[model samples]
Target chain A: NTLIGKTGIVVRNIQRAELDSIDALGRLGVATVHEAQNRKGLLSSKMRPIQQGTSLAGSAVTVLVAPGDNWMFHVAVEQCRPGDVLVVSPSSPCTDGYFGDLLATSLQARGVRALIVDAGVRDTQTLRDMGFAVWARAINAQGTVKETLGSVNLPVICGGQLINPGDIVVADDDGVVVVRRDECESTLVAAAERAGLEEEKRLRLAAGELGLDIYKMRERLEAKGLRYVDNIEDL
Target chain B: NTLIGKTGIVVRNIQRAELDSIDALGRLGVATVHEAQNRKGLLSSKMRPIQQGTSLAGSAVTVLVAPGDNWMFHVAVEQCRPGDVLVVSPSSPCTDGYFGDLLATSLQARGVRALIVDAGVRDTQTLRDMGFAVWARAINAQGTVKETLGSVNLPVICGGQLINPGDIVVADDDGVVVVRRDECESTLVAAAERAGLEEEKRLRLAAGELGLDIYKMRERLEAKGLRYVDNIEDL
Candidate 1:
């Protein structure tokens, strides 16, 4: 409720401290919030982590590029602030190794939390040691050129979701989810409530209640043409 | 073997760290020799890691769920010995979250190493904190029904590979690979050799050998297809 989000796209950045608070709630994890929003806002399954043991939640700072070029990503690096998840996508899909150790070095110094690209990444061992989180579509060693011009902090669709500057991007091991900046507070509340309800269910199941009986699906199963036969031999 | 592998299936589990040592070679990571077998035995892209910072290498306990039915996952659990990994599939593909926290608790208690499924998974927050590794096709809160019975320890295809009981499943943040049960030692030796050669390459690259130069592909590029087309009429 604290942030009065942009009516549309904004060139300005979200505050660093505010971004941290949003990220904290995000550690409740992506599945909780994704389900909280009725299964809205997941990045595609293709965006996978470059290193093990890295999870992230932060405001989005998006960039777009022409295919197979790293030109706009440099511009994006300069625009990045701490506590942001840099999301890069092309005018179309590009799987060239457009991001790697050098760019990751620059992004890390800027305090970027992670990189989610609809492109490719390389230098996995170096990236892991530095603790930089990258979720990218491919792992190509093909290098890219910096000739093409592109936009930064513009409203761009990365992984099928419209991510604007300052929209919350939540990513843990499950995968990434985007929260429209305005709905952050409301979604946080709903996600928290849903997580609590699951806890109560977890306790009951642990106390020896079978999920079949706990969820009360027996009658529904019978209605759905599921029958229990005494034995396959008799049948 | 303590337990007999199924008549046609498997009764015995593979040794623990022999599988872990393969995962260590896998730690040379996915774009390495793991792909050197030419990318066979991989699960589909839909299956993703359930928790960050976790990895698994162990024998499989395969299960088949009649679409929308989860009764057999329970059956598969009883068959799991310590250091086993569980692989589940549906007779017909179903997207409901057919596995969750309670089942995870049971599997972990039995010392099952990980869970992989072609269906969906819920309770990710609890699963992660429990350090119970899962690689699943989707994430959903829509619960499942357990009415119809299904078989366990039978060969089931998950992530595009036919997994038999005792097939080694190796997974980390990079991705998943199924090592044929009988071929574990040979694959492990090959993967270790590949990892060492990659280490030699890594040292050279760090000491300043570009991939282009290391592979010496400049003239080769032109010899194949890539070119500098200065004029439209040059072609």
Candidate 2:
């Protein structure tokens, strides 16, 4: 069984790289990256506010695991390289805990950047304490049996998008977003420029600014028949 | 013409407040906020990244204008309030330069938040230099005529949604998003909590954690028919 576990799956070489952090990425507004690939419900309804941290940027190393199975994860580890983010999506919806702290420890040793799973996870407290970056659909401690077969390093469906090896992955506290590798550099530049322009607006407003005057839409309003009524009685 | 211009509108009470800067809002990971109302776009292309800022949060104080005119902007000025983010959308599709530096100077004096228009704007350099925040569909300097009427504080359509007064608006370098007044508090709380949990994962990865173990789906992988093969040739 162990020998069978080590043979015959097609392993595609996905590109890899280290991520900067979410805060750094925010300086550039790259939307549609880092969106949650699956729906998640609140484990507990208690809302907590946290401080923002570093910006994160990475390339994907997608792993396709069958629903209710995780045998491919062990196989994927061998395929992972430094600076890669493991993006896992099951063939179907199943929230059985598929990842935990042990796998996080292993991936970190290999310099893996992050984990995005479209399945359930366990050991929330430990994972939280360990500081592993993981976005998953559920936080459950439910156990499972190892009795299935699956493939690794295959294109996987995540968050309504096909994540092939080498796609650029950007995520923050807002949500996870993915940018196609081909568009990464240009999108990055655009996000940065928009941020700078907004900053200038911030300063002006601090010194007392009104958007109406800044945008000069008064005449436009007049042309559109936007008239004022002097008294409530004047129908 | 001046009396007709001034007579067409009655000055409503002006309210104004300074808001937290866009950079500060970006730290919270709230990505999109709709800034304009009643304005439709003919084409939507991504803007260049601004490199310097992120996340935008505010409320939309929408001004409805007649197509091809912007005279009522002068009226809306008197209604400007602190924390108010102005969202201007015309009655129809038009890209006349309705906003410029003169209005920006007046708005800056009143501490209005940001500006989002579904039309055109002029004096880009001055607006940029004055630190005025403006987001428009076109950067046209073409002039407009003050020959129509419009209304302030009316429900207006923007980005395919009806924007009402006091609705929470957030915009980033990426795009705009609006949260209805009813959903604002809850959404903010939920977003904040999610941010905290993500932060915990960040620390775990830095300390070397593996997602596979933390999520505990290994046996589930096996049960789901995920088998490992020793070599690609063995298949």
Candidate 3:
């Protein structure tokens, strides 16, 4: 968070979240990981998955770029490797298509697991076909310039969430959630426990147990002034 | 907003926004109408479209249902007509699958244009195949019950947006935005004007004009302490 003005510097070597912990968080998915982290670290809901039935968890390689510029992404790609998720955010709000098939192709070759962009992305069909998972603010066709100088491996605010390099990123159909690298191990354990408890609740719910009774909502509903009547006429 | 306790009552007659205005807003899509209306009526971004390439602008028929219950949806369908979007929200937060193909079939018969649900929805495949557009909080297989009593044509908070009966609902891949029925005409006019201006900007952007220059963002970026350097070595 303190590196906003310190642009054009590349941090080549940084600690990544444990691979095992990253995989565990990905399996738990965004919602579970978000709740496990005390409801913090969720990117805005606007950062939607470009493709369905795909989820990813990897250490972030955060990139900060100027509005409507893709220059930093080209620089950021060289800093990425296997298990890295390139997280790109403009210095300010801009929905220009900053990434596309060419970038995805390069990232995929480098073993990058996913991409999360706070701006728009183009070539969604090609990106989906390649199975390179992405969560972005918009699916736009607007092109961008590569003339601006930006930074790599920087702390960035993507979809309103501050993501530092090496933070664990978990994204799925639900949405994107990030965990600080320092908190990754502990968050993974909490996420696993939460997922197991939710599975039990899911089974109970599948068995026709009412949430009102299971989640103990009847009393709360009553307190909230929820009233029931036999029919519309009765009201 | 004050109709919380008045449950189990159905309002059969509610005024709808103008048809021409709804069409205009739909063509302008969610983002433009949201901006044109002073950014006041946007639903939470969590409400995502199940199927892409579909947008809807119709008068709302708001429904309030108990948590994990779809009972009121059945009642609400009967109150709908052409150009109506059935906007459903639980009395509390619950992500159970509350609407599906069967209910969609019924609504389509009544000329309902779309559905916006602040809860999970199942049978998305069939719903898509049938060309019945929907925006929902989640897509889950979990089922709901019919035991609780709720109300139709009531003011309900769906996706954190206060939607009243007859409010204009404009939704697309960008997400949902609602306009007050009382202000529909004015909003529509503003939206059209905004859309025209955006079209001009789009052309300028497509012609390779950078937003940093076109939107006059350099001064803002400089004020925010964004620095530029020739290379990483320079930093």
Candidate 4:
């Protein structure tokens, strides 16, 4: 409700302690934290990392930009600090390449680690060459014009996930997941526990135990009307 | 509308000519060819490639597997020949890891080139080590049970794209696109021309011609009631 549609509002100096804690949570992948948090912060599957096997873990500095525009990105750069991830969303769908090489250069210089965009991006070959990470809705060569100067450091929705500035953004080859700035500490601990449990099970899986037996999914299947039949006609 | 939900059907041997033409279309990226087709065939941005810069272009062997099941993937394997890409979808939403190391092993032994799944995947590290590519809705460690069967070598929607048994599936980091089996030859011709046109435009763009000018968009913008003003008071 605050500063929706307002222009050029950039908040700086997020607590260093808060940031260090977020960076600490980076040891946990998005999928683990998603399980720990009851699956609430997983962004839509639409946000894809440019490089598979690339992982991003940082705090969001959200941007609301006019569709097909890039001016706000310039303002956003000044607001970024080390370990920040810039997230951008348009008021509507815009697949124009709104961010690219030079903008990535600026962000990387500021120590911004990654980006999650609801729109589009360009210069992917260069972005990958620079070792800059980005997860986006599309890879487009279509260019953009300037903006009406939508706000920075405000909340915005990207890939159907409501993201506020400073929320922890964890993205990898799997997908992007967000952790509210406040919940990440406990979430990380719980995520580590969940990851450990999965690790034990993963070893069992590698040993060739049938998953149906491992998880006792057969009972649930029968309960759910998934009957064992000789053929489709038996249904 | 075409053999959906009917399990145990498998069609084989898409023409070698068709598969090569589809691969030839890779002279252009999916995004460019998407525009040449008036923007159809673009799989929703939700599906993501497992490896960055990995490209999959081949004839489809589509599958409709029951949610949280792998029985149909096993069924689809016998129908696969060299250079086939397995595309799968569920009748409902399920992000369980429905395919993994063993299935990849089987599919690869039969010469299946890659996979495009509307479900999640597991054993990613091993899958990658083996050089098998996948585009999936999620990267999950969750396991699934088989026994429930769904159709194979039939048309099924994956990532909102209607994929048919012999359709050309072209996927890269940008997104996936399908070209009808019959239309791929002409589609490839048109796509190559379109790629050339874009190459020219890209150079112009690199030389600093503004997009608004290059595309002659200002008149359209003015027609759409956009006005340049110094401030909000100008309204």
Candidate 5:
């Protein structure tokens, strides 16, 4: 006999990444981790930050909900612990405002760190004022229903990335990138190193170093037949 | 023998949308024009504006350039007239800074209105300072070459939109959209009508009318089995 879990079952007590490691990754920001991971695990650019100047990283509490329905969000809240980033994805494409300020308040009460929903979210001003960071597909005024059955703390695809429960999600102005739970520690280290290297380059760039000179592209440009001309007619 | 035009030849003349019609569509913005055109002609969301609070529309002067080479941009400039919008696309995907302040100055000298390029662009601060509106796929400091041959005033795909030489291009914070040259006048009429209706709805919303009441979504929600319960356990 085979034992199978129901589709709507909520799995509690999944393992999570270290809080300090998540914070470190968040400090490195999304672009740094994306490059550190060799350009993998980036959510779609369609996933945009709702408010500005906010960056965060937290263990994902994954939720899979039905189209235009947000019932599973309430069910998932009890499963959330401190420092969790709620990652919600509808089973299919949906742009309904599946989240807003009231639901955000409930999650905030549970000490959830942030939200990354592959659907719409409303109440932008309230969400901003409460300092709850959110990355969403759309900022829509349309409301959603709460009657469908779905699952929590399960593997789900959000923003074109297959996100599993307890994965590390880092988000900022550049957008979001997910680090596998098992690779969180290594990713944090690599991202910190990458950030240091980038800082050094940023200093040189600030000091008026041309990328062409720093990167040594003069020979490459000549090989590619690029020419310098004084006038448009010379071309 | 079949007679065919050379690929590198620049077409000197093409039909253009009326300046007044272009202005009318610009006032309506990308969203209204998109909906008015039955949700068509929207470029990919990746085409983001370099600055804010600026919206524009103008006749497209299409350029098909080789990847990482911006020679065609210079060629296309002579084809641009007053109120023209330069629409540039690489023959293949590239992220080089294919356009910058110097090229922008040349286009601006011809009274060009704006630029929409499906490649990287730099000198963002200068562009903003000069009021040269731009929508681009990426903003990279990596530069480009100018040796390759290309075509001007040709049909090109930019930001996933197939744009003809004289199509009407409208852009704003929402993103870019194209109106077929032949349909420019009709689209202007439809977009103006849509703007009027949206303004009415906006006033109602500002006056405290609920979308549930205004859009009449109660019946749909109830029919979809949405339930209201006082407690979590009741759910």
Candidate 6:
């Protein structure tokens, strides 16, 4: 049965370039997309210190699930769309097997981008084999009964922030952050400028520059009552 | 005259690394590196991001400088060994050309890896062209007098944390984080395990799995007072 609802909220979508380009933007030193937004969650078990991997950017399709019950996730599936990420947060803290392989296949069919859950998941090996990006609190095989009701597409807290549907969700090895749809362009521009300036400084240092000379801090030290001593005995 | 003093504390030699691998690690998703540990200062007319780019793994050689004085930095050059990352922070906020091309050349000749400064820097394009990795607050070319005294290799505060000699400094496109030398191996192992689990979930989603089925949440939905709706008009 189709589980679409009327009162659900859907925010505007902001298109960005490929994930790799986004990752490059990060290297240029842009804060996480949701850096200004509140975020708190168990680190994703699927992460590595790739040190130089690409970016993961997509719109958020937020879902709130009751503890140990993911029936609403089925409801969320009907709402899934292309270029969207399925973000789940339990009504309360839970580490039960709340997500796994089957759900990933369903989401992938609709072109859902990734999954970031503040609760636990199961069937880890299968999920990895599928190549569905997921970040969660724990990995458990314990089953959860689908006997509870929860809301979807409403303002639900995930990663410690109130996420509405369609908010821009960006995640990487660093962590997950959300960018409000309206601020997308501005944030990207600022981040790009910052990256360029840093690149310039990197070049100078390579040419044998000292930060002390460039920043001009020598006299400030003497003004602050700093005194040079040749030996410990001289103090 | 060489500014190396007898009472000055030189705790450890900071190691340096290339930037590419660190950014890759962020894509792989390792969490909990000490946040960026660089000072921000005015250089030229632009503000620099506190942290940008990725670095190969390396150790830190921390330097504590008095405000506005870089005599210790000069001494630090002599103390630096090969493969070190120089972490510099001033006792107070004062950026008066504390570092420049001359000192960078010295450090490079001795094989310094990178520089993390908590102040301003100048000669931006030069540094980047030179291929030196520098994370600083500003890109100013302001000039200063070298008439002050400071300490080198002493315990100093950087990026809001106390950095000691021998600390393992890791940075990437996501940002910079410091791990105590002793905790290095364990943290790496834990982070690696986490990444593996995440990969499993990725695979599951790719194969058309649904979180609801994998998590087994149908019964819980009924238990929680949620009833499936047949049509969008049905409330």
- Top candidate by lDDT: 3
lDDT at position A206, candidate 4: 48
Per-residue CA lDDT of model 1 for A71-138, tens digit only, reads 87777887788888888888778899988889899999999988988888888788888888888889
Among all windows of 10 consecutive residues in model 3 chain A, the one with the lowest summed lDDT is A1-10
lDDT of 3 by residue, A7-29 (tens): 65667776788888898888888
Q: Give the lowest summed-lDDT range of ten residues in model 4 chain B.
A: B8-17
Better of 2 and 6 by TM-score: 6
DockQ value for model 2: 0.10
All candidates: DockQ: 0.08, 0.10, 0.03, 0.06, 0.03, 0.05
Per-residue alpha-carbon lDDT of model 2 for B1-235, expressed as tens digits?
1221123444343222224433333346433122122122211333221122544556666677777777667667667665667777788887666776656666666666567777766555556666777767664434465667666655566655566656665665665555666655555555566667767877886788876666687889999999899999989
- Model 5 over residues A12-33: C-alpha lDDT tens digits? 7678889999988988899999
Note the chain A TM-score of all models in turn: 0.88, 0.76, 0.93, 0.89, 0.93, 0.73
Ranking by lDDT: 3, 5, 4, 1, 2, 6
Ranking by DockQ: 2, 1, 4, 6, 3, 5
Q: Lowest lDDT 10-mer window, candidate 5 chain A?
A: A1-10
The TM-score leader among the candidates is 1
Task: Give the interface RMSD values of the models in order.
Answer: 7.8, 12.1, 8.9, 7.3, 9.8, 10.6
Question: In candidate 1, which residue pairs get closer than 3 Å at backbone N, Cα or C atoms, i.e. clash?
Answer: A53-B53, B4-B11, B5-B10, B5-B11, B6-B10, B6-B11, B44-B159
* lDDT against the true structure, each candidate: 0.72, 0.58, 0.83, 0.78, 0.82, 0.58
RMSD of each: 10.7, 19.0, 13.3, 11.4, 11.8, 18.3
Query: Which candidate do you rate higher for TM-score, 3 or 4?
Result: 4
Where in model 2 is the C-alpha error above 4 Å? A1-8, A16-54, A215-235, B1-11, B14-235
Which candidate has the top score in DockQ? 2
Please list the residue runs of candidate 4 whose C-alpha ends up more than 4 Å from where it truly belongs after superposition: A15-21, A24-27, A223-226, A229-235, B1-88, B92-126, B130-235
Q: Residue A17's C-alpha lDDT in candidate 2?
A: 32
User: Clash pairs of candidate 3?
Assistant: none
Question: Which digits, one per residue and each the tens of the lDDT, describe model 2 over residues A11-119?
Answer: 7665443255333443342222221211221111111111123235567777767677787787787777776778887777777889888988888888876787877
